[PDB]
Structures are given as C-alpha cells and as structure tokens.
From a paper:
We recently identified the pneumococcal hypothiocyanous acid reductase (Har), a member of the flavoprotein disulfide reductase enzyme family, and showed that it contributes to the HOSCN tolerance of S. pneumoniae in vitro. Bacterial HOSCN reductases belong to the family of flavoprotein disulfide reductases that, true to their names, utilize a flavin cofactor to transfer electrons from NAD(P)H to a catalytic disulfide within the active site. HOSCN reductases, including Har, MerA, and RclA are expected to form a sulfenylthiocyanate intermediate instead of forming a mixed disulfide. Collectively, our results demonstrate that pneumococcal Har is a highly efficient HOSCN reductase, enabling survival against oxidative host immune defenses.
Numbering used by the authors:
A (entry chain A), B (entry chain A): -3 to 438
The structure:
C-alpha cells in the first residue's frame, strides 16, 4: 500500500550543479537530505551528461585518429563514468536519491510516483534546481521533420552527416559546427542576425570568422527561414532567397527554465515575466525556505554560475547570508572553437557606452613567440583598462589554452589589482600567458 | 686605417634578454646605444636560438606527423625567424649592433675586431649580458669522444640515434629525454644522485617517474662514470657496475657564467667565489656604471629572470632605483616533460624546514573531470598554505597546460591574496584551473 509522507531537512529537485553540491554538503554534515531526479541519464546534471562534458570530450576526440563511431563511443564512456561517479558520490554522503519527476502539491510538499503508488515528501527547505530545456523556434516543420535535432540529439547521430546545417549562432551552435567540421561534415551555419559574434570584440570576431571559414565552415547572416521540410531523409531549410539542403539539421537557439513539470500553480511561488522562477539576492523565492538555483532562476547559463548559486544559498542557510547575488564578482566565459575564445569583464564597446576613461591594447598570437613554438598563429589578446582607477575592465584571450589563461585575469579583477601589476609579474616562458606583460603595458 | 674610439651612452655586451630589452628601450627614448654580439647564430640570445624556443618547438613538432628531419627543419625555421626578428627589432630602435666578441681594455672601454682593424668603444653605462656556457664534467674521454654532445649539439644530430644516453638529471636533460623518446630513441638517463627530481614534491616526482618509465625512458640513479670512450661510432659510458652503449650521448650538468672572453683582469670588476660577476641589489658591479644582468651574475637561469634584471637596472638608470633584486616577488618554473610539471613557492618539505604553520592538499588529475575530457589522466595539483596568515606558500601543478595555470597562483601570492579566495573564484568550465576551487578548500 502507500507510504506515509517522508520528512527531510532539505529536498533538492533536480540533479543540477548547485543542488548536488548543497545536498552532499548538508548530508555530510548530518542533515537528512533527499534529491529527486527524473532521468537516470541525467545523474550529475546537464553539464555531465548533455552539456559541458560531452561537447568538449567530442571536440578533443575529433582531433585524434578515431572514426566517427569511436568518437561517439568515447563520449559515452566519459559521460557514463561521470554519471555514475555523481550518483555514487551524492548517495555516499547519505542523500536519498529518488528516481522520479517531482511536482508540487503545495509550497513544501512534493509528490513522486514510486512504483504502483504515489509518495509525498516534505522539508523545511526546498531547493528547486531543474535547469533549462531547449528552445524550439515556431518555424513550420521544424518540430516534425526527420533528421532535425537539438543540442542533445546531435550528440547521438547514427553516422556522420555529409552536410550539416546549424540554425542559430551562439556558443553552442558554433561549437557543434566546429566539431562536425572536424569530423568531416560540410557545415553551414544559418543565423537570423546581421552580426557574427556580436558580443565579442569586433577584431576578435573577425579573426574567428576568418578561421572558421578557413576550416571550411560556411557562416551565413540575415537568414530568415519560412519552413523546414524533408526530401526523403534529407532536410530542406526554406529561406527567402534560397532553400538549403542538409543530411541533418541542428537547432541551437537558446534554453529556457524548466518549470512546467513542477505544477507551480499548486504553490504561491512566483515566476518572472519571462517564465523563470523569481528569486531574491539569496536565490530565495517569495515562499520562505523555497529557493531556485542555476538556470531555472533565469541567471547566466553556466555550470560555474550554478556552483556560485550554491555559495549564495549555503551562505544564507548555514552562514550569515553575507554572500549574495549582489556580491558576485567577475564571470568569465569560453567558446571552444579552434582555438578557444575566452573573455571576461567589459568589451571596449561596453566601456565606451558607460563613458569610462578607458584604453585598450591588442596583440595578435602571430606576434607571440609561443604561437610560433606551437605551430599555431591563430588568435589575439585584447585588454580594456581604466586609465584613471588603473582597474582592469576586461580582457579577451583568443588562443590555445585561453580557457586556462583567462582565469589569470579574473584573479586580478576580483582582488582590485591594478593593471600595471601584469607588467611586473614574472611568468613562465615560453608560454602564451607571459604576453600579458606586454598586453598591459598601456 | 683604424677608427677613433666610438662613444655611446650605453653599451650592452651580449644579445641576451635583459640586454636587448634595455638597449631597445633606451634607443627608442633617444639615447645612443651599442649592442655587441659575438655570433650571428645568437641574435636574440640563448632562449631564442639554443634554449627555451628550440627545445619547446622540437617537443611540439615531435607530437605531429613529421619525420626526424622535418622536426629538426621546423625548429630551424622557427628559431631562424625569431633570430632575424630580434636583430631587426633591436636595430630598428636605433641600436648599433656590432658583430664581434668584446673584451675590456679598462673598466668602460671595450675592444672588438672590425675587419682588418681593432675598434674601441666606450660609454658611461656598460651592461654585461654574456649569459652562460655548458658545464663539461671532468670525466676522462667525455670531451674527446665522438657522438658526445651538449644541449646545443644534440639539437642538430644527423639522424635519430637509436639509443640515446643522457648524463645528468635536471630540467634540460629530462626534457631532451622526453623529446628523443617521442622521436623514437631508446633513452637512458644516468644520474649520479640517489633521488629523482629532489626539488619536486615527492608525490609529484613519483608520478613523473612513473609516466616517463611508462613512455619507455629508463631512469637510473647513483651512476658514477669513470670514463667515456668510443666503439666505432657508438659511445660507451663506463660506470662502476655496467658499461652502457649508446648511438649518441647528451651531457646536461649545468651552465656557468660566460666571463673568460671578457678579459676582466683588465678592469676592477669583481667575481664571486664561484666565478659569477658579483652584483649588488641594482645588478651593479663594484665599478660605478657597470652592471651584470641575466645568467652571468650567477642568478637563476631563466629568460624571465633576465627580463626582471632589466626591470632592476632600468629602475636604477631611468627611475628612482626603488625596484631592486631584494624586492623580487615570486618566481615560477616549468619542466616540459609530458605533461608539463610546474611549480612556484615553497614545497611542503621547505615549509616544514622553516617550521611554518602549514597545511597541504593534493588532488590527482585523474579525479578531475577535465582530465577525462582530455583523455589524459596524468598529473596532480598540490597546494601548500599557511593556516595562520592564510597566505599561499606554494603550489605544484603537474598537468596539461600547467605552464599557463601556474601563473594564476603567482598573481595571488604576489598580491598577498588569501588562499581562501581560490575557493570563491568563478572559473571557466570544463578546465583544469577550476579544480583550484577544491585544491584550496583546506
Ligand atoms: C550543449 C551545451 C553545452 C554547454 N557548455 C557549457 C560549458 O562549456 N560550460 C558551462 O559552464 N556551461 C555550459 N553549458 C551550460 C550548463 O550545462 C548549464 O548552465 C548548467 O549545467 C545548468 O545547471 P543547473 O544546476 O541549472 O541544472 P541542470 O544540470 O540542468 O540539472 C537539472 C536537472 O533537473 C532534472 N529535472 C528537471 N525537472 C525535474 C523535475 N520536475 N523532477 C525531477 N528532476 C527534474 C533534469 O533531469 C536535470 O538533471 C552547456 C549546456 C549545453 C546544453
Ligand atoms: C637547453 C636550454 C633550455 C632552456 N629552457 C628554458 C626555458 O624553458 N625557460 C626559461 O625561461 N629559460 C630556459 N633556459 C634558460 C634561458 O635560456 C637562459 O637563462 C637565458 O636565456 C639567459 O639569458 P641572458 O640574458 O643571461 O643571456 P643570453 O641569452 O645567454 O645571451 C648572452 C649572449 O652573449 C653573447 N656573448 C657572450 N660573450 C660575449 C662577448 N664577450 N662578446 C659578445 N657577445 C658575447 C652570446 O653569444 C649570447 O648571445 C634554457 C636554456 C637552455 C640552454
């Protein structure tokens, strides 16, 4: 028969980054903790299974002597191991992991299916960590044509598509274009926008466009699609001036908070106008003791932002609440094209818009000895500084290893270190990082 | 006939790092500057032509689909271009570059051969930047046997040696062992010392030994050589218990200040007991206005230390002398085995010896998601901190990209940032650097 409602100190909904971190921390401290996750293919969350880890594992594998099928299998081995490592690490702290989709019956009661019965759970603290789901554009035929995939489906194709279309121009789409180009596909990116990489420094965007085109990718702007349909197994993308034909189509046009399954109408929890779970500076909803962390609260969609939401909630629950969303320091980013394009802080354009007293300096990797050592002259560094306060406003690092190097910048920005320090730092040599000695001699 | 003595504001002896930097800086500012360099194969100095740049260029090339001869030619292309880039950048500032070996006639007069005549030059400031030369052990037969090379000769072998011996166990020897092993040689390292990598953390040295042996290198300790001789073209290294046979032998047992050619007996300039040019905190000799920078002053032998000696001398000549050798901050190092082994600050053993209130933490790369993404689980991170002051005392980063990552640590050590900051920094993901969030949760 059915069980009586189970009471925990904390319930986490979703095996996301903030949630699994908070759950294990409090279970290790002796609290009674439950974590509810709808899919065994998602133990450890989006980054482990469908996001950060498989995407970058596929790109590393594609540079090696492996067939398409071997690259896919390598990705499955790596994500499968981390999936099991995450389940077992969380359960090993004492967290009770439930395999079900949770929905709310009231502010702090959830229901799950548990075999032939429903089971209810409650707690004093509920942390909603349900992530996001792919946007699907309302283009007629997109959702019903064969060989059309989102960013998850594209990771499990049966064979290499000879021609791959990508609809959208963000980090995700461009990383997959780079991947499939390496694997051997003829790749065309179709973007509605006029400007390629409009958030990047223009000089850096121009280099990126050059390198992607050199590598054989076709980058199209101002593309307005009226319909998607099939011709046999192939996909036709019908646009104003041309119909494009592909063996597979990826769409990558954003992801939105995953809130529908929760049945929030059964609670007092408020959504934002855009559909995210609304939170205050402590990631708390308007219901006391109910929080929302990671992508579902509408914040920046990176695993490291979900991790920092754990720091905010843990500060409020276990500490004195002194670290809040209003205190968050600098947030870098990387897009793993070839080479990686990394950035932190303000661009020149952003500093100009704020009327700050700024200066910039740019050095191409082609002028750097380590670029010659590497046999790879792609990329550039660009720094943006405030000539009055001596603060570093931002930097772009587009180069081999930039996903590591960018974090050098963040240490100095977070700690209010003047930009002139980088002219004095003693760097290892030969490296790309030592060129920061020259980039900051402004 | 002969020319009258030429007068400059500054004479630099040797195309080293500090010297070429100072020469171009002051010539660009309108001073009259001469730089005297004995070998056109050395324009740009040791790192460009025989040191940092060819060694690391050979290691990158050896990972690619290139024959031995193609790897050597690639190295020659890269160093040749940087040699010409350095000559032309320095001459383009207005420096007069003389192709000769300089020696002193008195404290601030040098003589060079200039065609069929001698030429004298003088200045108010002389900067001696003559670098170092390879040590050659007094082993009978070492200096007279065929197929025995120092670190320069080993970069120009006629063909791959099937078996390569390396005598000595520093960064230089081990990097060349790694290189020739990749290229296909059977490599044996013969070290007199009992302990492998005695300056590294022991756990890190043990991993390095494991990986080098996995890769096929033989690492021998406590080897005392009594003679080197030839058998035909092969080299025999006669040691107490065994005679080793190789197709070529590298010796790499250190480099010493290159002072003999200068004829310093014709000046008042003092040497240290070990034979370096003695300097004060401003890199100044006991003769006012004569300085010694880089390896020749006995300091740490890295290009980035020679660069920092430029900062010291420039502070004294052009500024207020407020930055001195006594003010130098933290100096990292990398040894480019596979993967690179980087370090900065104190080891655990060094902190223990100083009786500091320290704690340590170590995380293997095998426990880090990016190691799995990379398909490379080699290496580890180790942090050493002061639990009272919260300062970072030191770190070891042995991993892919560690030569970039180590510089993250230096920013925090130089700026007195507490180690707990690294638990809060928002790093890019997936990367090896983000694991600093966990390494510093001590
Ligand atoms: C293709 C791609 C590439 C990316 N690349 C990077 C990158 O390089 N770097 C980076 O930092 N970020 C990257 N991201 C973003 C990053 O993956 C996400 O921002 C982050 O993982 C989201 O974490 P989260 O904590 O919000 O929750 P998630 O990790 O999304 O977890 C939510 C969990 O909730 C579960 N769930 C949902 N609803 C319910 C319910 N009602 N009941 C039970 N379980 C439920 C889901 O099954 C899921 O496991 C990438 C994302 C994608 C898709
Ligand atoms: C194999 C090897 C690998 C190395 N790897 C690295 C590394 O990865 N990273 C690192 O930072 N360091 C490394 N080093 C060390 C680094 O190369 C040296 O520490 C640094 O380059 C020395 O610079 P310097 O300014 O002292 O002068 P140098 O660059 O040594 O220049 C001295 C110049 O003086 C000239 N000269 C000498 N006497 C006279 C004279 N009487 N008249 C005229 N000219 C003269 C020489 O021809 C030479 O060009 C390496 C060294 C070697 C040999």
């Amino acid at each position: 028969g059915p069980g009586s409602m189970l009471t925990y100190d904390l319930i986490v909904i979703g095996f996301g980054k903030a949630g699994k971190t908070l759950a294990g921390k409090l279970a290790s401290a002796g609290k009674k903790v439950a974590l509810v996750e709808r899919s065994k293919a998602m133990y450890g969350g989006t980054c482990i299974n469908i996001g950060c880890i498989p995407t970058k594992t596929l790109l590393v594998a594609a540079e090696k002597d492996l067939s398409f099928e071997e690259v896919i299998a390598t990705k499955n081995t790596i994500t499968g191991r981390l999936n099991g490592k995450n389940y077992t690490t969380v359960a090993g702290t004492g967290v009770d992991i439930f395999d079900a989709e949770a929905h709310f019956l009231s502010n702090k009661v959830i229901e799950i299916q548990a075999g032939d019965e429903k089971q209810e759970l409650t707690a004093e603290t509920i942390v909603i960590n349900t992530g996001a789901v792919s946007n699907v554009l309302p283009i007629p035929g997109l959702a019903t044509s064969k060989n059309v995939f989102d960013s998850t489906g594209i990771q499990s194709l049966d064979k290499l598509p000879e021609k791959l279309g990508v609809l959208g121009g963000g980090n995700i789409g461009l990383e997959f274009a780079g991947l499939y180009n390496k694997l051997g596909s003829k790749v065309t990116v179709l973007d509605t926008l006029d400007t390629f990489l409009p958030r990047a420094e223009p000089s850096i965007a121009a280099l990126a466009k050059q390198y992607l085109e050199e590598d054989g990718i076709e980058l199209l702007q101002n593309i307005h699609t009226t319909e998607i349909k099939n011709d046999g197994d192939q996909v036709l993308v019908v646009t104003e001036d041309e119909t494009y034909r592909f063996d597979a189509l990826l769409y990558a046009t954003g992801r939105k908070p995953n809130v529908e399954p929760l049945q929030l109408e059964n609670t007092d929890i408020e959504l934002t106008e855009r559909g995210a779970i609304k939170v205050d500076k402590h990631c708390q909803t308007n219901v006391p003791g109910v929080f929302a962390v990671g992508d579902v609260n509408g914040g920046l969609q990176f695993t490291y932002i979900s991790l920092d939401d754990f720091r905010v909630v843990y500060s409020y629950l276990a500490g004195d609440g002194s670290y809040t969303l209003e205190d968050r320091l600098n947030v870098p980013n990387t897009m793993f094209i070839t080479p990686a394009l990394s950035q932190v802080g303000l661009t020149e354009s952003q500093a100009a818009d704020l009327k700050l007293p700024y200066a910039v300096k740019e050095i191409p990797v082609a002028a750097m000895p380590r670029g010659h050592v590497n046999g790879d002259l792609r990329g550039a560094f660009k720094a943006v500084v405030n000539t009055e306060t001596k603060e570093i406003l931002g930097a772009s690092i587009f180069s081999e290893g930039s996903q590591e190097i960018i974090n050098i910048i963040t240490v100095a920005m977070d700690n209010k270190i003047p930009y002139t320090y980088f002219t004095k730092q003693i760097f290892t040599h030969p490296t790309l990082a030592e060129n920061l000695n020259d980039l900051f001699a402004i």
